[PDB]
Amino acid sequence: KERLLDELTLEGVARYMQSERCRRVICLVGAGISTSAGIPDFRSPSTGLYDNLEKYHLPYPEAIFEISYFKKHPEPFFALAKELGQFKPTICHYFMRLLKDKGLLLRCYTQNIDTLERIAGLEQEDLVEAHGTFYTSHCVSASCRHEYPLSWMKEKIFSEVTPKCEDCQSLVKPDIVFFGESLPARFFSCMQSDFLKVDLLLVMGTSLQVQPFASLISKAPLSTPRLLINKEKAGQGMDFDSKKAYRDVAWLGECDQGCLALAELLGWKKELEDLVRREHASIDAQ
């Protein structure tokens, strides 16, 4: 256990980041970085968007995202999907874009399916979309696998007609990883290479409750500093407070503010706000 942060604070992390020792940063991100876009966190205790779905009489809220339940009762999921593209990436997303443009970003691992990282301008090389994406959709039957674009799916969703394969009549499923499905091979492939060489783990907007994604915090070497920007402490192995704490830092608050506070310390606050402004205005002018 070599000690790489001089102190366990945001400022300490900021100084380490500006040091020659920090060349490779991995970001693990979850639902917290997209809630200011308006996409609610569907595992948060007080979450406010299963409201409409009372008519479907769910065995419990989470069933909607279970693969077994979905395949027999897809309607609740698609009604949710019509309520929710219209979302621009947030400050958190553009901070990651900033890390890439400054040559610090090794990779962003995301739990989110909203595709906001790509919109913010992270390229496909830089991203591991651990739970897949809404962008593309597939017929669920092994011997058809017909591909349908977002355009097609949205037409079906907005009309409240359950998406169905035009060829074989099977269910058409967005390319996301439902609970009980396997993660993409890219996830397992990238983790084997990425985590050997990482100098800093930035964990943002995730309570680290979904496996195997959550186990990624364990994969970096023992000396690797780990910063959690989140509403509350999570991943507790993450040791923030014990007298044996040596490398993990928690910044508790909304992720956007954490990224602004961190960016401020690195001297990038101005470049960040300018980037966000220009990128938003470009999406508006679309």
Binding site: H131, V177, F178, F179, G180, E181, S182, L183, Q209, V210, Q211, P212, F213, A214
Partner: peptide, 5 residues
């Protein structure tokens, strides 16, 4: 291996 929790 499978998405859980």
């Amino acid at each position: 291996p499978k998405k859980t929790g």
